[PDB]
Structure formats: structure tokens, C-alpha cells
Design a protein around this ligand. Sequence first.
Ligand SMILES: CCCCCCCCCCCCCCCCCC(=O)OC[C@H](COP(=O)(O)OCCN)OC(=O)CCCCCCCCCCCCCCCCC
Lengths: 174, 96, 115, 98, 83, 347, 99, 171
Amino acid sequence: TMYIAFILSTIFVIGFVGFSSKPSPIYGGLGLIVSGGVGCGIVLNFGGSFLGLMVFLIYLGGMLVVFGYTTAMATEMYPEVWVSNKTVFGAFVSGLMMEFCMVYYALKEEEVEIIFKFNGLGDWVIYDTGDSGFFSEEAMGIAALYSYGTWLVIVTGWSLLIGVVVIMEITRGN
Amino acid sequence: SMMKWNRERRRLQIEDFEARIALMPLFQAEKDRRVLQMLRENLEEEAIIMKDVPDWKVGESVFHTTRWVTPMMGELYGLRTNEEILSATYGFIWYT
Amino acid sequence: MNIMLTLLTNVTLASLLVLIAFWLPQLNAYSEKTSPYECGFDPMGSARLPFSMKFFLVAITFLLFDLEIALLLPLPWASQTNNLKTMLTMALFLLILLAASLAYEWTQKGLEWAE
Amino acid sequence: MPLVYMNIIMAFAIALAGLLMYRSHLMSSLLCLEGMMLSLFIMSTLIILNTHFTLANMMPIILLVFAACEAALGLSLLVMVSNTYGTDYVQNLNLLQC
Amino acid sequence: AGRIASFLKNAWAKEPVLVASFAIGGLAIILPSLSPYTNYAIRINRATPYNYPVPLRDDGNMPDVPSHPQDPQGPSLEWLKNL
Amino acid sequence: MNPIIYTTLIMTVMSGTMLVMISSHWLLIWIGFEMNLLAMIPVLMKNFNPRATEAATKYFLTQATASMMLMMAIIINLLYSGQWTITKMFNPVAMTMMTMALAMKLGLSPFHFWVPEVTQGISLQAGLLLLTWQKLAPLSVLCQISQSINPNLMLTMAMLSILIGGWGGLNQTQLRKIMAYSSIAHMGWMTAVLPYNTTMTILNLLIYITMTLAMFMLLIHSSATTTLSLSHTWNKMPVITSLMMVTLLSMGGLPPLSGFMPKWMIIQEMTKNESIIMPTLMAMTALLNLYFYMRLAYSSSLTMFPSTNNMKMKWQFEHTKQMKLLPTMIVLSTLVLPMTPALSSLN
Amino acid sequence: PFFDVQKRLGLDLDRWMTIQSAEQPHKIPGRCHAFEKEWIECAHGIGGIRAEKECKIEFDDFVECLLRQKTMKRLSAIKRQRDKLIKEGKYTPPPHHLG
Amino acid sequence: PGIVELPTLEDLKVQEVKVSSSVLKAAAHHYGAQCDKPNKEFMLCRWEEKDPRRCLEEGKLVNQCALDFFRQIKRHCAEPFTEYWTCIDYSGLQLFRHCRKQQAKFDECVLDKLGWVRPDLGELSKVTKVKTDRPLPENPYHSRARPEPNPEAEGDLKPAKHGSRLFFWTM
Ligand SMILES: CCCCCCCCCCCCCCCCCC(=O)OC[C@H](COP(=O)(O)OCCN)OC(=O)CCCCCCCCCCCCCCCCC
């Protein structure tokens, strides 16, 4: 129970290795949604309740769902399987071992310098000490989209309407 | 009816918030002493732990500024039991 | 964490029900028994039957509507601001743009299951 | 930096490598793009929650919606390519060499 | 006159759902700008005390800041009690 | 497409570019790039052939990958500074990520492969938009963050762009691929002086956009996309081919034409910084671009290729539409060298 | 911005989310509000070139606040040196540190 | 660099107010009414100084004022207060609205036996002023001196001497 965010992050990276080794896209999507679930859990452990539930509802139940639906239509006659290629196994194995080596090095050394400097002193350590009062600071920051973020709403809504128009232009096929 | 009821629910929330406001100086005064005591206890312990580390100097602020800096969880609970620091980190988040 | 225990229990009991469900019966299987069901005959595999642009278009339009819904979810807390006229203007703006996307898809064929 | 950040940035690097190293299917590359976006979302969320940058709490929402719009566009492109060639194989997208 | 009435007739006869939806959306657009109560909602949101009301030091010449919570100075919620 | 929908998509492309150029916030800059790409993809697929679809797909893949890398650079910068303002980057690897992302968006040499294929696969109007308007946003970002770029990385990419644009364009008979390789070389010229003087980058961009607009409008006026099709244009409208020849000479940077101004100013500004070998290399390498420009001029105006019998039909017909601002673009692309000191207005 | 339309038209299009010391909802403070404020008040109006050297202390304190790297190093040293003396049976953590 | 200076453990000792959240909430309105002076004075110190270590004795006075407030409750109707805070303690949100009968006979105690009127809605949320003796902190941020600004532009614009001077150009 002492370490929860680290198992979650290691599983996150494992799922990333799994779907980025690119088996047939249905198993890649399964790995992506496993990664998304554990990442939603990660941000739940950081106090990002609304953001993680957004991950769930819109990413895993929306965007993914649509991805798997579209894969179920444009696939191979025998939709492929993970095992069918030695390349998938090699990529997944290399990614898993580079995960294991670096997490072991960071755990037992705490001063790795792979591009960035890292210290696995813990993950609870960086949390600050204070009271947030009678509201969720995350929800207040996100609800400010309609009061502070007028410009953001304007450009995002315009881009979504343009996205509808754009999709209907491209898919017409003439 | 919903107008009547939601209007009443807003005054009740104001009353609750004012109860909290009245209680806040007590809680702030208590939290200050608690935090300072934890920091000073860590200091007294590290004066012992770090006796033999050669160039170590105990109490040395990581910051250039001498202004008060609110400690992180690591400075507060880094020398206490796993259950206590687990509570101080995730007790609210996990409470359901 | 209570919720984690609850999820563990639900998943564990569902998998246990699988294990009893999928191992307890007495089995005797031959080739023609497990043949794919096609109302008394054999099915044709053909070649990638699940097609037609309309199934993909409804998925894409649901995706974009779901994104705007993601933009609408913070609304219960948005009504708690002192600057209520700006917030109301922006929420209604987002909803008009949702209605405009629906109307544009509607008028330009869009939502139709054509011939 | 804490080791969660290490693993999140590592996930982004793995998604980038998986996208740059192609295979036959286009959908696999699009899923790698989606993984890159998801790692960006989590990194942004961790940074924003940790430093209590309250107004920046909305930034991950915007990132998610815009990247999903791009994903819809890419899915439509894949569907057009498949309707041309019956598959989403990138090796059929080579007739611009001449 | 008859043209708009006839259009509304045809819409009510063939697409009542769209008529109801457009009327509801139009009222949702229009009615808030005429309500005396919208300002009241703004005031209620303003009168909700989320934060601590950290005090001030009376340097003299502060005759409108109360001193005590129950002094006849500072804003009053008597209006909200009857609304 | 619907004329209203096409106008809206064009306006959305320009508004994404403007969002990039008017924002102080990195998230809004990323939003502008996203909006530009979203609106740009349909204009590439306007004709809708498998070539157009493949061009759009390759464009989308490169631009989306670049955008994700740019967002990662922004997030690393925020991780180390907490800053959203577009200013110097506070992290070196974030700066490297951002530089690579912006170069991939621009199509610089190590990320140049998409430019020739996409330009060939789309129509001349789409290519005109692609090679003129799409350079503004990444270059403006680069000019804003120029004080923190690694000069070695940028100069490497610019020199490679010049070399590859020179060499790749040598082998082309397709006018769109020739335009794309010329664009790669000119982007290299723009980005070489970027570490030293962003005003020179703006000047070179304006001159290049003028020349590219003139050349693409002449091609659209000619309806020619191959060198042999252009070789018939003398027997229809020789004025167009002579104007095209002077424009190609300008593109080669031959004095006293307008295309010589950016090279001359950039060489001067570079020698001001003890940079002598690189300007000499760049000027020498541009002779390749001038070589295939001169090949096009030979086939188009300076000599007369065989025509066809069916060309007599086209003689009795005028153009239904007329290219806007083409005479102005031609004069600006050839005759503006005496006005060089006006470049200080860009300061 | 390349074209500072906001400062010409007086509009606040995106400057409100640009720093964590800007005005926040319900006046919720940023975690590094004082550090950012001090660095910004040091670096104001002297240009980035001067601000990079002459405001180095404020930016260093800000970066330490954001990513507590040196704080984490010191805590890690205290932790691992504590264990370095648990094994030998040297240091007994006191009752208020064990329960 | 530098030593973080810390108070000792006995600089931090105080008579604790050891009553629970429901007991605290039940008396909260009369507590705000009766204990405003040291509470607002300590909150002034905390926001003015941005330092827990600078306001310890004010917090120590906060504690004493709370303690004496509760000892005044205890000697007149500890029993109605006990019933009221018990009823408040039952509900999982510690709601006031479920305990109005008990709040009623707690409130008509302190009037008759102690004089304590209960603050009205909004009074406890007011920003008040405190007449403190503590000097106003001069540099609460412990700020360094700010850098000297670049010299401003003075003088009138004259035309460029010999023009642009760009190569061969004379204007
Ligand atoms: C020194 C630098 C510049 C050098 C180049 C100058 C101009 C060169 C023009 C082309 C020269 C090469 C071709 C020579 C063969 C003859 C011309 C040709 O190719 O076609 C001839 C044809 C004639 O057309 P015509 O029959 O008159 O049409 C009547 C209506 N049916 O069509 C024509 O005659 C068309 C002619 C077009 C001319 C275009 C001019 C563009 C602008 C020139 C700028 C010059 C700058 C000089 C230096 C300035 C420095 C600041």
C-alpha cells in the first residue's frame, strides 16, 4: 500500500510498450485502454478526480470505443494476433527490459540521468501540506473555463464546428 | 418550489461556511504549532543521524531566501511511520 | 482504499463465475457441433463485411458531440461564479454551437441512412 | 524529478518510437499517436495539480478535446484510404514517388 | 401576417419537436436578460463566504469597516433572509 | 466543395495562423497550429483523387507528429519553469524538441520528404497555399524563440535544406516537385540567418512568398504541371513564359532582380558575425537551384519546343478567370532591388 | 506575441493563464506564488538578457519550489544515512517517530 | 543556504482546546461572537507576516480565549450545550438544520445567563478591522533589491546621419 503510484506508472509504461509494439490494432487498443485506466488512477491519486473521470468517460468510453469500432470494420481477413510476428515479441520484450533496468537503477541509485535527472525518493514526498477548504481546487480551476476562459471556449467551439464541417467534406468521397 | 428550497439551501450553506470561518483561527493556530513541532523534531533527529556525514551541516535551508517556505510532505513525514505518511498523503483522497 | 477493494471483489467474483460457468459442465464436442451457426447451413466468410461509411460517420459525430459534452460537464460548478452573465453567455454559446453542428450535419445529408 | 514523471515521460518516448517505427497498419500508428496524447495529458495533469496552478486545470481538457478532433480527422483519412485499397496498409500510399 | 402564421402552422403540424425545441432555446436565450432575479443570483454568489475574511489594521480613518462582526458596519444579508 | 464552405475553411486556416502569431500563451499557439491543420486537410483533398488522398494523409501524419512533439516541448518547459508565455525556453531538451517540431512543420531537410510528395499530390492552388501561407506560423514561433535556439542544430538543418533542395530539384520534370525543392532551399536560406537577425528571415520570407505566388499563378494561368506541358505555353501566350523566365531568374538570385536581395542581406549579416564559410557554402550551393531554374527557362521561353495541332483550337479562346494581383506579384518579385533600405521598416 | 494585438487593443485573451501568480478563482494561491512573484518583480522591464544573470537567485528559488530537486536530495540523504545506521544498530528512532 | 531557524518544542506548548468537531461547530457562532479580538488579531498577524513562527504567542492567546469561552459555557448550561452538540454529532455532515430545537435552548441559555447574542447571517463573514500594537512588517517577502532599470530614452529625434548608410545608398 505504501507505493501505489509507482506500480500504476510502471503498468502504464508496460501498456505503452504493449500497444506501441503494434500488434493487431484491437490488441493495441486494449493496451491503450488499460494504459488509460491506470493513468486515470494515477491522476486520481493526485487529487485530479474530475480530470481522471474525464479520461475515463471521454477517452476510454468515447475516442477509444470509436477507435475499436473503426478497427472492427477496417481490418484484415484474418484479423491478426499478437503472436503472429516475432517483431511484436522483440519490441515488447526490449521495451519491458528497458523498463525493468531503468526502474531498478532509479530505485537502487535515485540519481539516474537518462536525458533528465531523476530521484525515486518516493512520490508522496513532493505533495504539499495544506488545506483546500470547502471546495475542490481542480473543479474551481476547470469551472473557470466559462468565466476566465472565454477566448478558450470561443476557439475550441469554433474548432469543433469546423471539425464537423471538415469530416463531412473529407468523407464525401467525390 | 425549487426556487424556495434552493434559496433556503443557500442561507444554510452561508451559515455553515461562517461556522467554519469562526473556527478557522483555532485551526490555523493549531496547524502552525503542529507543523513547527514536526519540523523541529525532524531537525533534532537529523542532528543525530547526520553527526558523522562529514561536510553535512544540519538545518541548512535549500533556498537562498530566508523567507518562510511551506514544507512539503517529505520534510514533514519523511522520518515517520509508513501508516502516518500514507495517511497524510492519501487519507482524504481515499476516504469514501 | 475501499473503492479498490470493491473493484477487486467485483472483478474476482465475475471471474470466479466464469470459471464455474466455463469448466463445470460435462463436455462432448465434435467438429459439426461447434460449426458456426447459420440457421442450418454454413456461413460464408466473404471479405471484410462490416463496411459502409455511415457506421463510421455516426461514430465520428458521436465523438465530436462527446467532446462538446466534455466541455459542458463543468457547468454545475460554473454557475457558482459572481460573473454569471459571462458564464451564461459562454454556456449558451457552447450550446448554440452544438445545435449548429447538429443542424449542419442534418441539412447536408449527414444523419441520413441513405440508399 | 519524482519517478512517476520519469515513467510518464518514458511512456511518451515509447509512443513516439512506436509511431515513428511504422508497420503495415495505419490504425496502429494512429493508436501510437493517441498514446502520445494520453501521456501528454497525464504529464500536464500531474504538473498542474502538483504546483496547484488552478487556472491551468482546464488545459488538459483543451488538450484532450483538440487531440480527439485530430484523431477524428485521422480516422476519416484512414477510412478514405481503406475505401481506396481495401486495407489501411501504408505501403499502398506510395504512388507519389512518381 | 399570414406568411409567418402559415409557416408556424406547418411546423406545428409536421415538426412539433423542432418548434418546441426552438421556442425553449429562444426563451432560455431571452428570459435571463429580463429577469430582476439574475442580479439576485449574482448577489447570492457574491455573498457565499468560501474564503476566510482576513482582517485589516485600523490605521484610523476606517469608519465603515465594522471592528466586530456584530457592529453596524459592513454588508448585511437581511435582504437574502426574506428572498 | 461549397464556395461558402471553402471560404470558411480558408478563413479557418488563416485564423489558425493568426492565432499562432498573436498569442502570448503556448497553449493558444498549439491551438492555432491544430486549427490550421484541421482546416488545411480538406483543402488538400479538394479534387479528391488517390494522389490527393495520399498527399493529405502524409501531410496529416507529419503535422500531427510535429504538433505532439511541440506539446511535449511545452509541457517540459512548464515542468521546469511553470511558464506558459512564449519566450526563451528554460529547458534545453524542451528547446531541442521544439526546434525539431517546428522544422518538421516547416519541412526542413531531415524532415523534408513530405514537401515534394504533398506538393505533387495536390492541385496548384493547394500547393500555392501550402508553400506560401503554411510557412508563416512556424517561422513566427521560431523568430519569437530565436534567442534560445541551438545555433548548431538550426544551421545544420538550414544547410542541409539548401543542399537537398538543390540536389533533389535537379532530377525533377514535375513542376510541383521543382517548386517543393525550391521551397526547401529557400526555407534553408530563411532559417540560416534566424539565429542572427530575424528581420532578415522576415525579409527573405516576404521575397520568397512574392516569387512563389508569381510562379504558381503563372503555372495556374498556364495550366501546366510538367516541364513539357509548360514547353507548349510559348505557342499560346508567350508573355506568360517571358514573365516566368524573369521570375525564374529572380528565384536564382541573379542581380539586379529582387531575388538577389535576401541572399545579399543574409550574407552581409552572417559575415557581421564572423560567419564566412557557411555563407560561401550557401551561395555556392544555390547554383543548383539556379541550374534547374535555367533548365526550365530554356524549355519554356529561351527556346521553342514542338507544339501540337490541337493548339490552334486554344488560340481562339481567352481565360475565363484572371489571377488576382499577378502583375503586382511579378513586378514585386523582379524589380524591387533599388528599394532595399526599406527593409528597416521590418525592424 | 509576434503581433501583440492584445496589448494594442487592451484585451486579455490568454495572459490570464500565463503565470500561476495571476489572479486565481476564489483567490486560491499557487504553490510557488511568492517565488514566482519575486522572480517576476526582479526581472520586470530589464530584458531577458539582464534578467537571466541578475535574477538568477530568484529563478533558482522558484525552480527549487517547482521541482524540489535539492530538497529531495537532502531528504534522500537523511533517509539513506538513517538506514546506514539502523543496520549497525546505532540509531534508534524516537517514540514520536515510530508511534 | 542558511539555517532555517525554528522555535523550540516548549516555545510551542499550549493548553490545547481538546473538544471535537461537533462540539466546536455547535459553539462556533457564539465562539465567533465572543472571541473576535484575539482571533482576528492572530489572523492579521498570520496574513501580515506570512510566517508561522512570528505569530505563535498570538495563537497561544487564541487558545486561551477559546478555553475560557468553553469554561464559561460549562458553568451555566453545560447540559443544553451537551445535548445540542450531541445532536449535531449524530448526522454525518454535522448539519445545523437537523438540530434547531437543541440550538434553540442552547441559545436561550447564553442570553439569560451570559448575555451572548448569536450572530446573524452574514455578520460572521464580514471583514473587520483590528487595532494591533505589532508594527507592520517592512519586507515580509525578504526581497532582494530589485535590479536597476535600463536607462530611458531622452532627446529629440534627428534624421539618420547620411541616411541608411546601407552600402551605396545615399538616403
Ligand atoms: C536585365 C534584367 C531583366 C532581363 C529581362 C528583361 C525582359 C526579358 C523578356 C524576355 C526575353 C527573352 C525572350 C526573347 C524572345 C522574344 C520574347 C518572347 O519570348 O516572346 C515574345 C512575345 C511577344 O508578344 P507579342 O507578339 O508582342 O504579343 C502581342 C499580342 N498578341 O512576348 C513578349 O515579348 C513578352 C515579354 C515580357 C517581358 C517581361 C518583363 C518583366 C519585367 C522585366 C524587369 C527588368 C528589370 C531590369 C533591371 C532592373 C533593375 C532594378
